[PDB]
Amino acid sequence: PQVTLWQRPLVTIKIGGQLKEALLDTGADDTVLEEMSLPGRWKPKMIGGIGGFIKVRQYDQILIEICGHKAIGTVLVGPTPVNVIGRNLLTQIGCTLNF
Amino acid sequence: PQVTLWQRPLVTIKIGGQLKEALLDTGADDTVLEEMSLPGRWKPKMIGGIGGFIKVRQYDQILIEICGHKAIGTVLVGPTPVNVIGRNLLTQIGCTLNF
Ligand SMILES: O=C1N(Cc2ccc(CO)cc2)[C@H](Cc2ccccc2)[C@H](O)[C@@H](O)[C@@H](Cc2ccccc2)N1Cc1ccc(CO)cc1
Numbered sequence A, B: 001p002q003v004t005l006w007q008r009p010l011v012t013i014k015i016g017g018q019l020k021e022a023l024l025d026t027g028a029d030d031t032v033l034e035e036m037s038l039p040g041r042w043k044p045k046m047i048g049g050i051g052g053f054i055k056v057r058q059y060d061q062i063l064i065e066i067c068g069h070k071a072i073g074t075v076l077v078g079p080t081p082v083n084v085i086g087r088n089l090l091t092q093i094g095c096t097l098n099f
Helices: none
Strands: A002-004 A010-015 A018-024 A031-033 A043-049 A052-066 A069-077 A096-098 B002-004 B010-015 B018-024 B031-033 B043-049 B052-066 B069-077 B096-098
Touching: A018 A031
Parallel strands: A031 A069, B031 B069
Antiparallel strands: A002 B096, A010 A018, A010 A052, A043 A052, A052 A069, A096 B002, A096 B096, B010 B018, B010 B052, B043 B052, B052 B069
């Protein structure tokens, strides 16, 4: 749909059988989720943001449903304060920025 | 303009007589820019990111031109690694998210 930016653009996602809300985030290259239970194997990474770097786990080929749309991609799970959906999956759902 | 998200959504801004590039960042409530010289009054502030917190200076009523659109608002200046335009200015230029 179209979403204006007067409030945070949150969406519901379903991931790993669980329902969460996430922020649509054009500044983020990748998707980063708060720590959660996910099968099964993963690789450690660092990411940097404002504030500094964090260490995260990388899971590839995870299925996520963002609104009704399915996508498969990498997710990073880790100590984020907020679930962020970045450009790796925003492109899959066809999201654009328009002004 | 419409921007797809296959690459980072960067724009040119003019602020304070200087020309910069900045990310359009729907996840950011506010705008924060790397250290640069602005004239005038500011207040200290601290913002939290992935990774932690930074201390930043808040300047109010700063004119920015983003693409060919002028906006006025608060900018936070500080040690961010990248300049981000957040929703406080994104609403002023009429930016929407569309999927
Ligand atoms: O750290 C932030 N990252 C860091 C980040 C890095 C990597 C990924 C995955 O690849 C995801 C997020 C982004 C901005 C940024 C990108 C690259 C380098 C430096 C900064 C993000 O794009 C922005 O949306 C918020 C996301 C966010 C929002 C709330 C709480 C935590 C995280 N932030 C922090 C931020 C907070 C406040 C303001 C001003 O109000 C601006 C930014």
